[PDB]
Amino acid sequence: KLLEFAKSPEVFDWMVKIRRKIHENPELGYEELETSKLIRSELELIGIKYRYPVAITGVIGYIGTGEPPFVALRADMDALPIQEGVEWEHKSKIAGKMHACGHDGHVTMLLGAAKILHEHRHHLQGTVVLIFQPAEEGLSGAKKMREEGALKNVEAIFGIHLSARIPFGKAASRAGSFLAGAGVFEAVITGKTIDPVVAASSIVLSLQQLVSRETDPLDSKVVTVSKVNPDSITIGGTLRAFTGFTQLQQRVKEVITKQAAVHRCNASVNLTPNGREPMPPTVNNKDLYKQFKKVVRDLLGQEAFVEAAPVMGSEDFSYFAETIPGHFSLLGMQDETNGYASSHSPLYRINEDVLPYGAAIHASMAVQYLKEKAS
């Protein structure tokens, strides 16, 4: 029944106005002042006790008994420094900033889920923790909330991401590794006279050789050299893998090291340069995935769940999912003729008719998780 509640004028109209208010006033990482104030106003109106501030602008709400088991639902708050190209009534009023990744929709659907869960709060066998996360785009926000104790005593966390790659109203996931990890590296190459330059060009080519694509998408490995700048040469770049992420880091370091040595050079390799720690692959807990497929099929029909392919994208939800059982899913918006622009596009649109689906999926997943836990 919560789908029909999610679609009702009361809830749907309210979600649309919230979404559009955020959309008109996009804020970047750690600067989500107005977005944070709106979330907190709505929690108060529902109402729902919360902790604030968490990671400057972040907010954590609670619904249910107030006691364990705690299950978390997550939305991200931040926009991107992109000029909106969509001409419409609720276009960004802030030039050069836009919600081009659906994050306005994510906050809204989580507030929708909070409204829905609150109506059933006395039946929840535990507590739903609503995590409104700042600064996803710079990949530091989830990590900062984790540092500040956002996951303490939390047994599971679920996140939804709106997608133009999945058809409207379908939800997509897969068990295990889902989104690729990402790391950076910096190496300094020094002679033990042309040897450092020779060593560097050799290193650059040997590293470019570690890019591997095969027939299983999870095997894909990317190593990029983005920086090279003669007494010493500094090489920097990035690496990505769905699996064997640590082994790829070690292989990058081994290549730099061995190549420098055979060119009579020293090499200093840093795999966390300037405190840039790697972000691990986003792994969907198998038990949570199984629960999610059943939730989605019960709520929206057998055909509504689609198995997602691995994605080489950037999503800091990985930091939550590395520390507790995590589940990250895609919620489709795409129409039959591919009219919805990709994430990050200046032409990105949310199909607002999706908002009730995400609200219901969030709510249902929380309820079922707690129910199953009790059984």
Side-chain angles (χ1 to χ4, degrees):
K1 301 292 182 171
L2 55 82
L3 186 54
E4 313 312 338
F5 186 34
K7 293 192 186 223
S8 73
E10 195 82 355
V11 182
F12 174 63
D13 298 348
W14 172 78
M15 272 192 305
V16 169
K17 298 183 46 166
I18 287 160
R19 184 261 163 153
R20 292 171 180 180
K21 183 70 175 156
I22 300 170
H23 196 86
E24 296 173 355
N25 196 15
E27 297 174 310
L28 308 184
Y30 299 122
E31 304 173 355
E32 314 94 337
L33 297 182
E34 292 306 312
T35 304
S36 186
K37 289 162 54 184
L38 177 53
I39 287 157
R40 273 140 54 208
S41 307
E42 300 292 332
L43 295 179
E44 293 167 345
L45 296 167
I46 302 157
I48 288 169
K49 281 183 186 152
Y50 57 82
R51 179 187 169 200
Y52 166 80
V54 187
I56 305 174
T57 51
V59 184
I60 303 179
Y62 311 98
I63 316 174
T65 70
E67 303 289 320
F70 294 107
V71 58
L73 307 173
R74 176 267 208 161
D76 33 6
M77 299 185 278
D78 57 325
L80 277 164
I82 290 163
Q83 175 57 53
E84 186 157 2
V86 178
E87 293 301 312
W88 71 303
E89 178 50 50
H90 306 285
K91 183 186 185 196
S92 173
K93 291 183 177 155
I94 310 295
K97 295 181 191 160
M98 185 192 171
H99 270 294
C101 280
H103 291 186
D104 59 330
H106 306 156
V107 167
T108 306
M109 300 184 290
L110 185 48
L111 289 165
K115 185 174 274 193
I116 294 173
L117 291 167
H118 179 270
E119 302 298 286
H120 302 287
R121 63 192 180 284
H122 301 302
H123 298 119
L124 302 177
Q125 294 165 84
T127 305
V128 183
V129 176
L130 309 164
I131 295 177
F132 295 87
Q133 184 207 304
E136 184 284 333
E137 293 292 350
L139 306 179
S140 84
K143 194 174 206 197
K144 187 58 141 162
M145 292 193 96
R146 193 179 67 187
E147 182 199 350
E148 294 180 18
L151 303 183
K152 179 175 171 170
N153 296 325
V154 184
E155 280 165 32
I157 181 172
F158 298 80
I160 293 170
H161 194 269
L162 289 170
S163 179
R165 292 176 44 263
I166 297 301
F168 176 87
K170 300 199 170 182
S173 189
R174 65 180 341 257
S177 183
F178 189 12
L179 320 175
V184 295
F185 63 94
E186 192 147 85
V188 176
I189 311 302
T190 55
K192 287 146 110 163
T193 289
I194 61 167
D195 283 344
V197 178
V198 177
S201 55
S202 172
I203 286 158
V204 164
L205 288 205
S206 298
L207 287 175
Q208 286 172 344
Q209 256 213 132
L210 296 169
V211 172
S212 196
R213 313 172 308 146
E214 326 60 4
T215 53
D216 183 351
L218 290 170
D219 290 339
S220 295
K221 282 168 220 305
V222 181
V223 178
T224 302
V225 180
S226 55
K227 166 166 212 161
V228 189
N229 62 68
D231 291 328
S232 63
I233 314 202
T234 297
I235 305 151
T238 67
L239 62 89
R240 315 221 37 190
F242 292 100
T243 65
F245 184 68
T246 286
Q247 299 95 304
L248 175 65
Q249 286 183 115
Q250 290 309 118
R251 186 77 185 100
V252 167
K253 174 165 180 153
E254 153 178 39
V255 163
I256 292 163
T257 290
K258 292 186 179 187
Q259 282 294 329
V262 301
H263 287 87
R264 203 169 137 205
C265 278
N266 290 134
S268 178
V269 178
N270 200 342
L271 296 170
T272 64
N274 308 315
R276 296 267 175 195
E277 268 149 33
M279 184 175 68
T282 304
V283 172
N284 282 351
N285 188 264
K286 185 144 145 197
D287 186 53
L288 300 188
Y289 156 85
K290 289 200 229 148
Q291 296 183 64
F292 179 89
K293 287 197 292 195
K294 175 176 167 204
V295 157
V296 163
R297 289 165 173 160
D298 287 355
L299 185 68
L300 305 169
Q302 181 70 209
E303 302 314 320
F305 176 77
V306 310
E307 189 75 19
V311 182
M312 196 139 292
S314 50
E315 170 60 78
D316 84 344
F317 193 85
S318 46
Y319 291 113
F320 294 144
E322 96 171 314
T323 303
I324 65 176
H327 185 273
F328 186 81
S329 62
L330 306 184
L331 180 58
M333 293 192 302
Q334 189 55 269
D335 62 12
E336 275 165 32
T337 63
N338 290 135
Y340 285 83
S342 81
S343 285
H344 293 265
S345 174
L347 278 293
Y348 183 87
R349 287 177 299 141
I350 288 180
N351 184 345
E352 292 174 332
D353 292 336
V354 82
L355 295 167
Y357 296 80
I361 287 162
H362 272 318
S364 193
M365 191 62 256
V367 167
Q368 294 310 310
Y369 180 85
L370 288 183
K371 198 162 283 165
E372 180 140 335
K373 189 73 204 308
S375 65

mmCIF file of all heavy atoms in Angstrom, residues 27-47:
data_model
loop_
_atom_site.group_PDB
_atom_site.id
_atom_site.type_symbol
_atom_site.label_atom_id
_atom_site.label_comp_id
_atom_site.label_asym_id
_atom_site.label_seq_id
_atom_site.Cartn_x
_atom_site.Cartn_y
_atom_site.Cartn_z
ATOM 1 N N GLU A 27 23.819 23.648 -4.287
ATOM 2 C CA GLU A 27 24.933 23.985 -3.423
ATOM 3 C C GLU A 27 25.963 22.897 -3.540
ATOM 4 O O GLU A 27 25.617 21.714 -3.673
ATOM 5 C CB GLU A 27 24.434 24.104 -1.993
ATOM 6 C CG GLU A 27 23.420 25.244 -1.806
ATOM 7 C CD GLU A 27 22.809 25.281 -0.422
ATOM 8 O OE1 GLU A 27 22.351 24.224 0.033
ATOM 9 O OE2 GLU A 27 22.725 26.370 0.211
ATOM 10 N N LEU A 28 27.231 23.307 -3.515
ATOM 11 C CA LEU A 28 28.351 22.387 -3.641
ATOM 12 C C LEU A 28 28.772 21.780 -2.289
ATOM 13 O O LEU A 28 28.302 22.184 -1.216
ATOM 14 C CB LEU A 28 29.531 23.127 -4.263
ATOM 15 C CG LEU A 28 29.285 23.884 -5.581
ATOM 16 C CD1 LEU A 28 30.581 24.475 -6.087
ATOM 17 C CD2 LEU A 28 28.646 22.995 -6.646
ATOM 18 N N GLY A 29 29.657 20.790 -2.366
ATOM 19 C CA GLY A 29 30.103 20.058 -1.206
ATOM 20 C C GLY A 29 30.532 20.913 -0.052
ATOM 21 O O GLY A 29 31.369 21.791 -0.194
ATOM 22 N N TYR A 30 29.998 20.589 1.118
ATOM 23 C CA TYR A 30 30.244 21.298 2.385
ATOM 24 C C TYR A 30 29.677 22.712 2.440
ATOM 25 O O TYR A 30 29.816 23.344 3.449
ATOM 26 C CB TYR A 30 31.729 21.282 2.757
ATOM 27 C CG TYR A 30 32.251 19.856 2.945
ATOM 28 C CD1 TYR A 30 33.316 19.374 2.197
ATOM 29 C CD2 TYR A 30 31.656 19.000 3.885
ATOM 30 C CE1 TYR A 30 33.793 18.072 2.384
ATOM 31 C CE2 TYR A 30 32.139 17.711 4.100
ATOM 32 C CZ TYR A 30 33.179 17.244 3.341
ATOM 33 O OH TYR A 30 33.574 15.947 3.537
ATOM 34 N N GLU A 31 28.975 23.135 1.380
ATOM 35 C CA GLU A 31 28.341 24.439 1.301
ATOM 36 C C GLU A 31 26.819 24.307 1.163
ATOM 37 O O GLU A 31 26.176 25.271 0.820
ATOM 38 C CB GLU A 31 28.910 25.241 0.102
ATOM 39 C CG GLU A 31 30.410 25.427 0.110
ATOM 40 C CD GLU A 31 30.984 26.077 -1.176
ATOM 41 O OE1 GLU A 31 30.239 26.327 -2.171
ATOM 42 O OE2 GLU A 31 32.216 26.321 -1.179
ATOM 43 N N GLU A 32 26.260 23.142 1.517
ATOM 44 C CA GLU A 32 24.831 22.847 1.372
ATOM 45 C C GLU A 32 24.011 23.430 2.542
ATOM 46 O O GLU A 32 23.199 22.755 3.165
ATOM 47 C CB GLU A 32 24.563 21.337 1.191
ATOM 48 C CG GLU A 32 25.471 20.602 0.186
ATOM 49 C CD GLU A 32 26.704 19.947 0.847
ATOM 50 O OE1 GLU A 32 27.105 20.390 1.932
ATOM 51 O OE2 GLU A 32 27.256 18.984 0.294
ATOM 52 N N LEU A 33 24.182 24.722 2.793
ATOM 53 C CA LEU A 33 23.533 25.388 3.929
ATOM 54 C C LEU A 33 22.007 25.380 3.855
ATOM 55 O O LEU A 33 21.328 25.005 4.795
ATOM 56 C CB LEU A 33 23.998 26.847 3.991
ATOM 57 C CG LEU A 33 25.494 27.022 4.230
ATOM 58 C CD1 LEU A 33 25.796 28.530 4.308
ATOM 59 C CD2 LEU A 33 25.915 26.321 5.491
ATOM 60 N N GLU A 34 21.482 25.813 2.721
ATOM 61 C CA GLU A 34 20.046 25.917 2.545
ATOM 62 C C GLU A 34 19.416 24.559 2.393
ATOM 63 O O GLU A 34 18.325 24.309 2.899
ATOM 64 C CB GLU A 34 19.729 26.808 1.329
ATOM 65 C CG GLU A 34 20.095 28.304 1.543
ATOM 66 C CD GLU A 34 19.459 28.891 2.826
ATOM 67 O OE1 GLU A 34 18.251 28.691 3.050
ATOM 68 O OE2 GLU A 34 20.182 29.520 3.629
ATOM 69 N N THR A 35 20.116 23.651 1.711
ATOM 70 C CA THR A 35 19.617 22.306 1.536
ATOM 71 C C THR A 35 19.508 21.619 2.918
ATOM 72 O O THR A 35 18.494 20.970 3.207
ATOM 73 C CB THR A 35 20.521 21.501 0.555
ATOM 74 O OG1 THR A 35 20.639 22.179 -0.706
ATOM 75 C CG2 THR A 35 19.990 20.125 0.286
ATOM 76 N N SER A 36 20.585 21.706 3.712
ATOM 77 C CA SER A 36 20.602 21.242 5.107
ATOM 78 C C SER A 36 19.457 21.862 5.968
ATOM 79 O O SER A 36 18.724 21.133 6.659
ATOM 80 C CB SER A 36 21.952 21.531 5.765
ATOM 81 O OG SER A 36 21.943 20.945 7.054
ATOM 82 N N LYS A 37 19.268 23.173 5.890
ATOM 83 C CA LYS A 37 18.139 23.820 6.625
ATOM 84 C C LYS A 37 16.787 23.278 6.182
ATOM 85 O O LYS A 37 15.933 22.970 6.995
ATOM 86 C CB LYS A 37 18.174 25.344 6.489
ATOM 87 C CG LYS A 37 19.283 26.013 7.230
ATOM 88 C CD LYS A 37 19.573 27.471 6.739
ATOM 89 C CE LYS A 37 18.319 28.382 6.741
ATOM 90 N NZ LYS A 37 18.680 29.742 6.163
ATOM 91 N N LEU A 38 16.593 23.069 4.879
ATOM 92 C CA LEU A 38 15.326 22.503 4.397
ATOM 93 C C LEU A 38 15.075 21.078 4.885
ATOM 94 O O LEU A 38 13.978 20.728 5.314
ATOM 95 C CB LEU A 38 15.298 22.554 2.852
ATOM 96 C CG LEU A 38 14.073 21.943 2.160
ATOM 97 C CD1 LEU A 38 12.778 22.542 2.737
ATOM 98 C CD2 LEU A 38 14.148 22.224 0.661
ATOM 99 N N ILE A 39 16.119 20.238 4.865
ATOM 100 C CA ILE A 39 15.969 18.878 5.313
ATOM 101 C C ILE A 39 15.557 18.889 6.791
ATOM 102 O O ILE A 39 14.665 18.162 7.193
ATOM 103 C CB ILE A 39 17.305 18.124 5.172
ATOM 104 C CG1 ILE A 39 17.591 17.843 3.668
ATOM 105 C CG2 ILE A 39 17.318 16.843 6.004
ATOM 106 C CD1 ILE A 39 19.021 17.637 3.366
ATOM 107 N N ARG A 40 16.249 19.679 7.576
ATOM 108 C CA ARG A 40 16.015 19.749 9.014
ATOM 109 C C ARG A 40 14.586 20.315 9.266
ATOM 110 O O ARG A 40 13.877 19.803 10.111
ATOM 111 C CB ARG A 40 17.106 20.587 9.704
ATOM 112 C CG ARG A 40 18.359 19.849 10.115
ATOM 113 C CD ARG A 40 19.634 20.610 9.872
ATOM 114 N NE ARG A 40 19.606 21.886 10.469
ATOM 115 C CZ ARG A 40 20.261 22.950 10.054
ATOM 116 N NH1 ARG A 40 21.030 22.974 8.969
ATOM 117 N NH2 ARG A 40 20.111 24.027 10.765
ATOM 118 N N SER A 41 14.135 21.289 8.474
ATOM 119 C CA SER A 41 12.738 21.809 8.630
ATOM 120 C C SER A 41 11.713 20.767 8.366
ATOM 121 O O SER A 41 10.740 20.624 9.126
ATOM 122 C CB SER A 41 12.480 23.003 7.735
ATOM 123 O OG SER A 41 13.495 23.917 7.998
ATOM 124 N N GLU A 42 11.950 19.942 7.345
ATOM 125 C CA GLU A 42 11.005 18.914 7.040
ATOM 126 C C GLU A 42 11.008 17.805 8.040
ATOM 127 O O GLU A 42 9.944 17.255 8.335
ATOM 128 C CB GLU A 42 11.222 18.348 5.646
ATOM 129 C CG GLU A 42 11.097 19.354 4.548
ATOM 130 C CD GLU A 42 9.676 19.891 4.350
ATOM 131 O OE1 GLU A 42 8.682 19.197 4.656
ATOM 132 O OE2 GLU A 42 9.570 21.022 3.857
ATOM 133 N N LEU A 43 12.174 17.421 8.547
ATOM 134 C CA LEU A 43 12.201 16.410 9.611
ATOM 135 C C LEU A 43 11.417 16.903 10.839
ATOM 136 O O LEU A 43 10.641 16.151 11.411
ATOM 137 C CB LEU A 43 13.624 16.045 10.013
ATOM 138 C CG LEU A 43 14.463 15.343 8.928
ATOM 139 C CD1 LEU A 43 15.875 15.052 9.441
ATOM 140 C CD2 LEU A 43 13.820 14.093 8.414
ATOM 141 N N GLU A 44 11.622 18.159 11.197
ATOM 142 C CA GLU A 44 10.886 18.781 12.304
ATOM 143 C C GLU A 44 9.376 18.719 12.055
ATOM 144 O O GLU A 44 8.626 18.308 12.929
ATOM 145 C CB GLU A 44 11.314 20.217 12.507
ATOM 146 C CG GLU A 44 12.719 20.459 12.984
ATOM 147 C CD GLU A 44 13.152 21.931 12.853
ATOM 148 O OE1 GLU A 44 12.475 22.720 12.135
ATOM 149 O OE2 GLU A 44 14.181 22.316 13.444
ATOM 150 N N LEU A 45 8.934 19.068 10.848
ATOM 151 C CA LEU A 45 7.525 19.004 10.505
ATOM 152 C C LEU A 45 6.937 17.581 10.511
ATOM 153 O O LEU A 45 5.819 17.357 11.015
ATOM 154 C CB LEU A 45 7.276 19.709 9.150
ATOM 155 C CG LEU A 45 7.547 21.219 9.056
ATOM 156 C CD1 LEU A 45 7.572 21.706 7.607
ATOM 157 C CD2 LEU A 45 6.484 22.003 9.830
ATOM 158 N N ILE A 46 7.645 16.601 9.964
ATOM 159 C CA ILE A 46 7.179 15.231 10.081
ATOM 160 C C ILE A 46 6.807 14.575 11.519
ATOM 161 O O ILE A 46 5.824 13.857 11.590
ATOM 162 C CB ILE A 46 8.030 14.267 9.169
ATOM 163 C CG1 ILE A 46 7.960 14.714 7.678
ATOM 164 C CG2 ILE A 46 7.497 12.905 9.268
ATOM 165 C CD1 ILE A 46 9.145 14.216 6.829
ATOM 166 N N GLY A 47 7.459 14.650 12.667
ATOM 167 C CA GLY A 47 8.753 14.891 12.954
ATOM 168 C C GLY A 47 9.547 13.722 13.592
ATOM 169 O O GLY A 47 9.112 12.639 14.100
#
